[PDB]
Design a protein around this motif. Structure first.
Motif, PDB file in Angstrom:
ATOM      1  N   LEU B 146       0.801  -1.219   0.000  1.00 40.19           N
ATOM      2  CA  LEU B 146       0.000   0.000   0.000  1.00 40.19           C
ATOM      3  C   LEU B 146       0.839   1.277   0.000  1.00 40.19           C
ATOM      4  O   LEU B 146       0.345   2.329  -0.419  1.00 40.19           O
ATOM      5  N   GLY B 147       2.087   1.230   0.466  1.00 39.96           N
ATOM      6  CA  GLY B 147       2.894   2.441   0.466  1.00 39.96           C
ATOM      7  C   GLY B 147       3.146   3.012  -0.918  1.00 39.96           C
ATOM      8  O   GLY B 147       3.683   4.121  -1.027  1.00 39.96           O
ATOM      9  N   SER B 148       2.792   2.270  -1.971  1.00 41.07           N
ATOM     10  CA  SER B 148       2.920   2.769  -3.332  1.00 41.07           C
ATOM     11  C   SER B 148       1.970   3.933  -3.595  1.00 41.07           C
ATOM     12  O   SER B 148       2.316   4.882  -4.307  1.00 41.07           O
ATOM     13  N   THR B 149       0.766   3.869  -3.050  1.00 37.80           N
ATOM     14  CA  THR B 149      -0.276   4.823  -3.380  1.00 37.80           C
ATOM     15  C   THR B 149      -0.723   5.660  -2.190  1.00 37.80           C
ATOM     16  O   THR B 149      -1.421   6.659  -2.387  1.00 37.80           O
ATOM     17  N   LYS B 150      -0.354   5.284  -0.969  1.00 43.65           N
ATOM     18  CA  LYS B 150      -0.614   6.073   0.230  1.00 43.65           C
ATOM     19  C   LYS B 150       0.676   6.188   1.016  1.00 43.65           C
ATOM     20  O   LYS B 150       1.560   5.336   0.907  1.00 43.65           O
ATOM     21  N   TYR B 151       0.738   7.205   1.826  1.00 47.74           N
ATOM     22  CA  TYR B 151       1.879   7.373   2.715  1.00 47.74           C
ATOM     23  C   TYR B 151       1.824   6.325   3.832  1.00 47.74           C
ATOM     24  O   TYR B 151       0.826   6.175   4.409  1.00 47.74           O
ATOM     25  N   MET B 152       2.914   5.609   4.018  1.00 49.99           N
ATOM     26  CA  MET B 152       3.109   4.660   5.131  1.00 49.99           C
ATOM     27  C   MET B 152       4.436   5.041   5.797  1.00 49.99           C
ATOM     28  O   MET B 152       5.338   5.371   5.077  1.00 49.99           O
TER      29      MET B 152
ATOM     30  N   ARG C 170       3.457  12.483  -2.497  1.00 47.92           N
ATOM     31  CA  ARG C 170       2.801  12.162  -1.238  1.00 47.92           C
ATOM     32  C   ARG C 170       3.809  12.122  -0.092  1.00 47.92           C
ATOM     33  O   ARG C 170       3.584  12.727   0.966  1.00 47.92           O
ATOM     34  N   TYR C 171       4.940  11.431  -0.294  1.00 53.75           N
ATOM     35  CA  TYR C 171       5.944  11.353   0.771  1.00 53.75           C
ATOM     36  C   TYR C 171       6.535  12.725   1.092  1.00 53.75           C
ATOM     37  O   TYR C 171       6.661  13.087   2.269  1.00 53.75           O
TER      38      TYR C 171
ATOM     39  N   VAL D 252      -3.807  11.684   1.671  1.00 54.79           N
ATOM     40  CA  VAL D 252      -2.655  10.867   1.285  1.00 54.79           C
ATOM     41  C   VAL D 252      -2.264   9.838   2.334  1.00 54.79           C
ATOM     42  O   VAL D 252      -1.455   8.947   2.036  1.00 54.79           O
ATOM     43  N   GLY D 254      -1.923   6.750   4.637  1.00 61.71           N
ATOM     44  CA  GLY D 254      -2.356   5.369   4.682  1.00 61.71           C
ATOM     45  C   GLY D 254      -2.449   4.793   6.074  1.00 61.71           C
ATOM     46  O   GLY D 254      -2.889   3.647   6.250  1.00 61.71           O
ATOM     47  N   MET D 255      -2.049   5.572   7.072  1.00 62.72           N
ATOM     48  CA  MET D 255      -2.022   5.158   8.470  1.00 62.72           C
ATOM     49  C   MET D 255      -1.859   6.427   9.297  1.00 62.72           C
ATOM     50  O   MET D 255      -1.782   7.534   8.755  1.00 62.72           O
TER      51      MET D 255
END
Ligand SMILES: NC(=O)c1ccc[n+]([C@@H]2O[C@H](COP(=O)([O-])OP(=O)(O)OC[C@H]3O[C@@H](n4cnc5c(N)ncnc54)[C@H](O)[C@@H]3O)[C@@H](O)[C@H]2O)c1
Ligand SMILES: NC(=O)c1ccc[n+]([C@@H]2O[C@H](COP(=O)([O-])OP(=O)(O)OC[C@H]3O[C@@H](n4cnc5c(N)ncnc54)[C@H](O)[C@@H]3O)[C@@H](O)[C@H]2O)c1
Ligand SMILES: NC(=O)c1ccc[n+]([C@@H]2O[C@H](COP(=O)([O-])OP(=O)(O)OC[C@H]3O[C@@H](n4cnc5c(N)ncnc54)[C@H](O)[C@@H]3O)[C@@H](O)[C@H]2O)c1
Ligand SMILES: NC(=O)c1ccc[n+]([C@@H]2O[C@H](COP(=O)([O-])OP(=O)(O)OC[C@H]3O[C@@H](n4cnc5c(N)ncnc54)[C@H](O)[C@@H]3O)[C@@H](O)[C@H]2O)c1
Lengths: 267, 267, 272, 268
Positions: B146-152, C170-171, D252, D254-255
């Motif tokens: 999932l870090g590909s499309t959302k920030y993790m 995003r990052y 954006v 994810g967590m």
């Protein structure tokens, strides 16, 4: 070895031997599942019964999702005949034909309500009715289409319905997930069915999909059925809230395929 | 019955019996597959060889994806030992430890190129090399997150690689669709592996997923393995260019789960 | 009233008066921005300098993003000339012509690295270099294309690059948001630029967009420019991490557009 | 003057000076727009009339989107008073408060239909009614929320409706683009409004957004208004069918956001 042996599922949406619901039920039966079926009316009942029989099932019940009074008898029938449920297939939709021709701006309020009620709220009412019967690890599946999240030619109000349906899948995945129950949507490519033939110029969609899909084919009934069975079976017990495309890859396309447009080679 | 009986597949990325590639290989083996395995180097060969023997395979080949010299001999080995391939598992990534700490802004050029070459370009080179051996209906599977499309948390360069990887899946799906060859990605939830245990943020990300996933669990290796088997088997022959989430439903959450109090706060 | 009045910005990627970077610079100038510009080499300087002057800027620096040694002098120039920066426009990409023909399968490793380094890592290095000069509230903008997340004819390795670029946005938005700094991507429809011209596949992608887009037109340089200025101005101070489509609506389309007559569909392409 | 000077716009959804519709209207007015406003009933007219007047609008019409008898009167009122329209703001939603409690599974059919009709079909009916008055280059904007495409706590049927609403934006963008008319959704982060305050879950969703958003803040009314103004003006004439996030970057994530291996919320 069958991945649904001893498992019990209710199939809502068979109309004939072309129904997506039938393809899924067949794959489930081939994996050992014990099945029950609903029919909308008496004319479809005469198609659903021989189909249920070829899958070893006498458990055939009436269900017009628009009639609230049909749901408690459904619950009673399933509880008496099956005892409990390991999976539900929600394979039903409807919008009046005149809403699918023309444009979205042109949609009447009653066409809007019918599409939403039959295609979307029916999943909420069906699952809530049957929730006490659902076993640990059970799987609820509904059917959707790329028209939910992209424009597709005069899917119109059904695109709105399927977008709400996919959202329902996400909220129901959370509601039921604490009971170890999964909820998913199978997003199928276009395929010839009773409901398909009711959309004017549907063969153009099917032909556009066939020429432009990565795999250069339309999906078969058995391909949709096998993907459904996977999502209904324990193989997919790590999968929930998912929209799973079974469409020969068509969803990746941002434009028409080329070689010159494949469409223009097709002339 | 076995959905990979007579089918031949190459497994790239086993490191031990916790590897995602091992979970997938195991499920593929239980479905009747004839398997072959690669190893990074002689140190990893000591664990790949016993796993291959356990799964009835005498075909163990060297592959460090950063070494071009390995690719043609891999081709020779597969053609001589197996003749052809029905599927390829691409379960390989790498980024320097320090790159997955701190911020993306600090990433060196060399660490950026390493992550991209090992995690993304390797799929292109592996598939192009083995393409003349791919049978009609063959299935290529890679692993994403999932870090590909959302920030993790601190995924950093590896979220860039994984985003490129999922885009490669789409273009390769088009490239190989011509020949009825499928390309997909399995997007797994966090799971303890040798590579994953090399991250400082992993325990906490694993715990965040467990508390907040719809199914309130981390995914098992067998669950990832079975979803991979499904994407590699003819059961999913209508599925290509897909990013398939096997993450206990976690992808649907837009915020922490609640009960209003965060489930996180209760634990 | 100028939405960028008194704001200082650096424009990376002007090549001539058709550049997306120029359309954005022009709309920023028209909203009162003070601008500086970079150029790839002395050949491109011959076009960047009159453009810079046209937009009231005497600050023109060399920047080849593939040469690390250019980045500290760039930092020193900007620091000496402007003191600090309120926005950056990163409008730069490259892939060998080979790679944007044929299949992704046959992409060489050197072409892949080149594409990724010029089109993606340059944004990391550019932003990391200038980062100590960025004021509170600053806005960083890069350019992307729908080929990141959907197949587009022969975009190939550049689709992979743009995917990673949108992920970088995003990052970086998370990294920089701690300092009230915003990072976005403008995803433009196709438009003829010097870099467009290198692709032999391009007139068709342009025409396909024009026929099939909701607004039945290609986007103009001014529309791309105005969207960029928006994302760079404080009007969009609630917006970060966004991939913003400026493409005449093309991104919504699941298939070719049709004309409806007598309940029957004809693709607009077929009437064309 | 600004990027809406001489432009005529209808604002549907002002409830008071905290309404998203108000902030968008205010920004449009500062760019020189000619504004007109609708109100639900006489109670709400009591606050819409002063607000329209501080924005130099004498044009104030009744519109309960559940009463289709209101719609051709609105058409007539607009056609007479303004002649035409360059943009429409659709800033309207409702679901029974019970339906945003608890679970989606307990949603009643009437609750579902009300939510779908008020929040989704009203965009279709409003736009179809006003279509002959829309000039070339017009812009139609509605308001959505991340609960359409992600799970958000107890958002339930409003998530289903906002998902259908964003789909409708896409189809309407195709339907209306023939006439160079644009349709977009502004997906705002949480913000305290009259409708939002009446949810038990909201305070916490606000605080969760504020801690975890990249910009580490909630969005202001003026940030939402300015983004709305941009989408309604010629500045965005290349943008249609878009879901535009104005949420301090929250979409954006994810967590939860972290810090050197600890959640920012735990420091909170
Ligand atoms: N191309 C396609 O055919 C395709 C592709 C994508 C998704 N789907 C989805 O597949 C599902 C099943 O459709 P299908 O294509 O198999 O066609 P189908 O005609 O075989 O099945 C539709 C079923 O819906 C039932 N139904 C309609 N109104 C009902 C009501 N009030 N109560 C109970 N049942 C009712 C019909 O009786 C029928 O059994 C639908 O949700 C549809 O949108 C279809
Ligand atoms: N939580 C998780 O573990 C998780 C979640 C999502 C996806 N993934 C993806 O799953 C895949 C497999 O990783 P894993 O978690 O099973 O860990 P793992 O350590 O078991 O496997 C990773 C493999 O990559 C191999 N490798 C590294 N560099 C290589 C090179 N240059 N050439 C050849 N092989 C090389 C290692 O030897 C190892 O066999 C990766 O793509 C990873 O990003 C992991
Ligand atoms: N034109 C389109 O159709 C289109 C569509 C969407 C997005 N994009 C993106 O817009 C951006 C700008 O491209 P454009 O279309 O304006 O073309 P352009 O040629 O006008 O601009 C590209 C610029 O990149 C610069 N550049 C290339 N390599 C460089 C290097 N090593 N160091 C420094 N600068 C270098 C070029 O010199 C040129 O100024 C690119 O990122 C492109 O991918 C273009
Ligand atoms: N407040 C938030 O955090 C937020 C976030 C994202 C999007 N939204 C969306 O913004 C829009 C505006 O809501 P808001 O937050 O400004 O709150 P608000 O209470 O100020 O506005 C809601 C408006 O809808 C109107 N309305 C309700 N039922 C109506 C009916 N039957 N006929 C006519 N008008 C009717 C109300 O009278 C009111 O003017 C809605 O679509 C909402 O879902 C709100």
């Amino acid at each position: 070895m069958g991945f649904l042996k001893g498992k019990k599922g209710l199939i809502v949406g068979v109309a004939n031997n072309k129904s997506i619901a039938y393809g899924i039920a067949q794959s489930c039966f081939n994996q050992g599942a014990t099945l029950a079926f609903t029919y909308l009316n008496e004319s479809l009942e005469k198609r659903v019964r021989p189909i249920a029989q070829e899958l070893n099932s006498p458990y055939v019940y009436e269900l017009d999702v628009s009639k609230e009074e049909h749901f408690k008898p459904l619950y009673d029938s399933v509880k008496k005949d099956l005892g409990s449920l390991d999976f539900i297939v929600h394979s039903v939709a409807f919008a009046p034909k005149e809403a699918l021709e023309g444009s979205l701006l042109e949609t009447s309020k009653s066409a809007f309500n019918t599409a939403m009620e039959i295609s979307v709220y029916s999943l909420i009412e069906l699952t809530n009715t049957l929730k006490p019967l659902l076993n640990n690890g059970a799987s609820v599946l509904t059917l959707s289409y790329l028209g939910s999240t992209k424009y597709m030619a005069h899917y119109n109000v059904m695109g709105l319905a399927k977008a709400a349906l996919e959202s329902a899948v996400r909220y129901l995945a959370v509601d039921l997930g604490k009971h170890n129950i999964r909820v998913n949507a199978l997003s199928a490519g276009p395929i010839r069915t009773l409901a398909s033939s009711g959309i004017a110029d549907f063969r153009m969609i099917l032909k556009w999909n066939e020429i432009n899909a990565p795999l250069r084919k339309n999906v078969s009934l058995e391909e949709v059925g096998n993907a459904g069975m996977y999502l209904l079976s324990s193989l997919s017990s790590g999968v929930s809230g998912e929209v799973h495309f079974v469409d020969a890859g068509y969803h990746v396309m941002g434009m028409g395929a080329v070689e010159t447009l494949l469409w223009d080679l097709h002339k």
